[PDB]
């Protein structure tokens, strides 16, 4: 049990560049709390991409520079300290980032989400703030797909809210009116005010959610062990899947919005068909909780929009794991194996991101890490 720095697969080496790293300028390992967590923006120039993650108290933003030496950790662009609530999650809005300015969502421990322009830095709003609309821990934070305004926010409670930025307040605590109630899930509207509606979802925490590629559905993983996913404008279930065992912790599309990937409370990964709405298979592997599950949008087959898959996934076992689903596979339930399963870190892995120049993973202690792709 000792950690891996490279692994290989059919297309070659992959290799840990430590000259990549980004951290703490501290550099001290980070022991503890809330995961760390990692979000990427583009701002439409040579060196664009901005880096930003969360560790303690302290949101770090940085310039990317993917394969090369990382920018000097010494001077961030921007940094927060948070000294009461800290940081759960985070996300850029890709559709209004420039070069003079970006808005970054970040969620709290106590439920409260917070925009920030780390660049222009004249702008900081707070949602949520007297705790009225829900008390527990934000678990994900999302710009709606091709919005510049809305943003979807899932919770410790069970809970959704829909926000808009241009939107306030509000002082009292919303009176709630429903506009649909399903199989296990309900939707409520209050009566130019902020929480939009409240969506409600299962029983117990709502893990993660994650919009297909093209933004129409919505898809959950709750503390019921429930995939649910759903129409988003239309507002209606379109499909569920349960496990074996536990709950379900992550979720990712595939880049052509077929397949929907679970990983869980079980160590499994699920494939499930979002037309089919079954189950299509399941890969042992982890030792451990599944903590981050993703596609790989460059090492498949498909053509994405507006047959083979590669995704990965990284869990508490502190290993990562890469996984091939093929047309034998797809259109014959089957167990995947992992074309890889290397340990790769000294705590829990939080952060699983395919980019086009390399792979991102990130662990509790702090460090983000960057993997060379074959050839990059």
Known sequence: NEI?????????LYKLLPHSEYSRPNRVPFNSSNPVRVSFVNLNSGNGDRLCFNVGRELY????????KAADLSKPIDKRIYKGTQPTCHDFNHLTATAESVSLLVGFSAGQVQLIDPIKKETSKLFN??????????TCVKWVPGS??????????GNMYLYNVEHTCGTTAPHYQLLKQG????????????????????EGALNEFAFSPDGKFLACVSQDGFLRVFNFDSVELHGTMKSYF?????????????????????????????????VIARGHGHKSWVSVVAFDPYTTS????????????????????LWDLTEDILFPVPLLEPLICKKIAHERLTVLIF??????????????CTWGRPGK
Request: glycine share 10%; with cysteine.
């Open 355 to 368: 980019l086009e120049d390399c792979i991102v993973t990130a662990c509790q202690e702090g460090f983000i």
């Open 246 to 278: 536990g709950g379900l912790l992550c979720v990712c599309w595939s880049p052509d919005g077929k397949y929907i990937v679970t990983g869980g409370e079980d160590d499994l990964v699920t494939v499930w068909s979002f037309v089919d709405c079954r």
């Open 129 to 138: 703030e007297e705790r009225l609309i829900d008390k527990s821990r934000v």
């Open 4 to 12: 891996k720095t490279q692994f290989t697969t059919r297309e070659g």
């Open 61 to 68: 933003f940085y310039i990317y520079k993917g394969v090369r």
């Open 148 to 157: 510049e305004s809305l943003f979807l926010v899932a919770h410790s409670s």
């Open 183 to 202: 199989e296990s899930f309900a939707v409520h509207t209050c009566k130019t005010r902020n929480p939009l509606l409240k969506w409600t979802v299962g």
């Open 302 to 321: 498909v053509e994405e929009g507006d047959v083979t898959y590669r995704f990965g996934s990284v869990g508490q076992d502190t290993q990562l794991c």
